[PDB]
Structure 1
Amino acid sequence: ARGPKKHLKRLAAPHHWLLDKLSGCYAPRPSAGPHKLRESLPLIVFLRNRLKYALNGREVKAILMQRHVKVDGKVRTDTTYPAGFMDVITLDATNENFRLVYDVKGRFAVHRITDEEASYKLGKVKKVQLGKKGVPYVVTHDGRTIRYPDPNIKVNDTVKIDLASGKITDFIKFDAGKLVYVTGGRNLGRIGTIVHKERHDGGFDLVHIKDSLDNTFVTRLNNVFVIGEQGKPYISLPKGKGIKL
C-alpha cells in the first residue's frame, strides 16, 4: 500500500450492510464524515437497498442532487456521505423521517419518525476538554463539538441536542440501573439496566446488565450508549425492544 486506499472491494464490505453478493465486484465507500469507517451507512446504500426508492446508482444520484434529502436538517449532496449510528434522515415529499438505528442481529434499520421526535438527537458525550482562551468544549461520538457545555457534564454521557438551532436541550449521566444501548460486541443491540460497573484502572471496564426478559450479560463502556431511565426511553425504539427469542 503506497498510500491511502480509495476503494473497497465488494466482498470485504462491512458485513452489516447485507449487500447482495452476485451483483458485481465493487462496493460503495462512504466519504469522510461525522461517523467512523467500518460502522457507517451511506445514503447510496440506504436508498438503493433499504428504501428501494431506487433501481440504479444514477437514479440515487438524481434524487440526491434534486435535494429532497437533508441530513440532520442539512442538505447533503454526494453518494458517499456516511450517516452513522442513531441518526436522522428527513424526506419532505413523503413526510417521512428515519431514525437510523440497530436491530436484534445488529444491522442498521429504519425507524419511521415524525417531526416532534426528529427535532431532537442525542450525542454520546465522549471527550470533554478546554482550549484557547481556556474555553470549554465537549466532543460527542458523531464528531460534533459543543463549546461552552454544562459543567454538569462528564465523560460517557448522553446529551439530547436540538438540530436546527443547535443549542442543548438536556442530558443524562452514566448511572447504574438505566435503559442504555450497547453499540458493539457479540451481543450488541440489546437494551436493559446496568446493575453496576466494574472498573479497571485505565483498563477494560466491564459492565453487567440485566435485560427485560431478566437475563444477565456483559458489555463495555466503549460499546454502551446511554439511553434513559426505567420506563422512559427518550427515543422511539423500533419494535423488538431488545427481546431476542
Structure 2
Amino acid sequence: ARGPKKHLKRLAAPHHWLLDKLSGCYAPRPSAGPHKLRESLPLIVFLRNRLKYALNGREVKAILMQRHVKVDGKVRTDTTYPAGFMDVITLDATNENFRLVYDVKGRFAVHRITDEEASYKLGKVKKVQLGKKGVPYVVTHDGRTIRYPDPNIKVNDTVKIDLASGKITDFIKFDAGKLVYVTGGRNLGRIGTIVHKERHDGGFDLVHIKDSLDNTFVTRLNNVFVIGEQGKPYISLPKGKGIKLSIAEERDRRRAQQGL
C-alpha cells in the first residue's frame, strides 16, 4: 500500500507483550533493528508495562534521554527500539542488569542478572559466508557481523560475544545432546537438550527435544537456539527452568502454596 507502514494497532501487536485491550487504540511499533518486529520488546513496553518504572510513554522518553538505559553496552535513546532475545538491558542508575529471555508461556520475563554476566551475550549464528576480500564472516540472530570467526563455526551453532568489544570468545557446535532453548512455536520457552534431528532436504528440518522431566516434543530447527550442555547452560535460566507443567500440575503448585 504505497510504502512502509509506520503504525501498529492494538490486537495487531503480538500477544506475548501482554498489552491491555482498552485504554486507547494503537501499540508501539518496534523500530527497524536487530530483531524481527513480531519477536521483540520495544523499550517502552519494558521500562513501563513490565518494570512499572514510568507511567506514561511521555515519561519513558524522559528516562532514555538521560542515557540511564543502555542495550548490549551502547546507549540507545529510541523509545520503540526493538530489544530482543539474549539482549542485555542495563540501567546505569539503579545499578541494574537484565537479559531478555523467554517464559514457558512464551513471554519475555523481567530477569535480573549479575553485573559480571551482563558483559557477554549469546548469539546464534544464522549465516556464515565468505565476504569481500576473502574475509569470512559470521552473522548472529540479532544481526551482528563478526569478521574472522573460527573456521569450525557453522550455521545453527551459538556464540559467546564480548559486548564491550565485539569479538567471539567461544562457540558451541550444534550437537546431538546440547542444551536448547526453543524460540518459536508453542514450545517457545521450553529448554530440552536435543535428542535427534530430522533431515528433510527441500526444507524444514525438525529437532527432537527432551527436557529434564523426560517429557519430549518437536519443533522446526529454525526455532532451536543452542545454549550449552545438559546441566550447565551458558546463561542464567529464568525460574521454572523451561519445563512446562500441565494446567493440573500448575493449579496444584499455585494452590499448594497458600498458607499465610
* TM-score for both structures, normalised by structure 2: 0.92
Query: Identical aligned pairs, as a percentage?
Result: 100
Secondary structure at 2:62 match in 1: helix
Structure 1 residue 219 displacement after superposition? 1.3
Q: What is the CA-CA distance between 1:93 and the residue it aligns to?
A: 1.7
Report the alpha carbon displacement of residue 130 of structure 1 after superposing the two structures with TM.
Answer: 1.0
Residues 93-131 of structure 1 show CA distances to partners (whole Å, capped at 9, x for unaligned) of: 211101111101101112101221111101101100012
Deviations 1:162-211 (A, max 9, x none): 01122211010000111110100122211112111110113111121111
| Higher helix proportion (structure 1 or 2) | 2
Instruction: Give secondary structure in 2 for the equivalent of 1:194.
Output: coil
Which consecutive unaligned segments of at least 5 residues does structure 2 have?
A: 245-259
Aligned residues: 245
- More deviation, 140-149/1-10: 1-10
CA distance in 2, matches of 1:116, 1:109: 20
Q: Distance in 2 between matches of 1:112 and 1:207?
A: 30
Give the secondary structure class of the aligned counterpart of 1:185: coil
Q: Distance in 1 between matches of 2:62 and 2:132?
A: 43
Distance 1:209 1:116 in 2: 31
Secondary structure in 2 matching 1:192: coil
> How many Å apart are 1:150 and its aligned residue?
0.7
Q: CA deviation at 1:30?
A: 1.3
Deviation, 1:2, is: 2.0
What secondary structure is seen at the aligned counterpart in 2 of 1:139? strand
SS at match of 1:74: coil
Q: 1:156: which partner in 2?
A: 156
CA deviations over 1:119-144 (Å, ceiling 9, x no partner)? 11011011000122111101111010
- Which runs of structure 1 show a deviation greater than 6 angstroms over 4 or more consecutive aligned residues? none
The residue number in structure 1 matching 2:95 is 95
| SS class of match (2:170) | strand
Q: Secondary structure at the match of 2:196?
A: strand
Whole-angstrom distance in 1 between the partners of 2:205 and 2:11: 34
- SS of the residue 2:116 aligns to: helix
| Alpha-carbon offset, residue 15 of structure 1 | 1.3
Q: Report the TM-score when normalising by structure 1.
A: 0.97
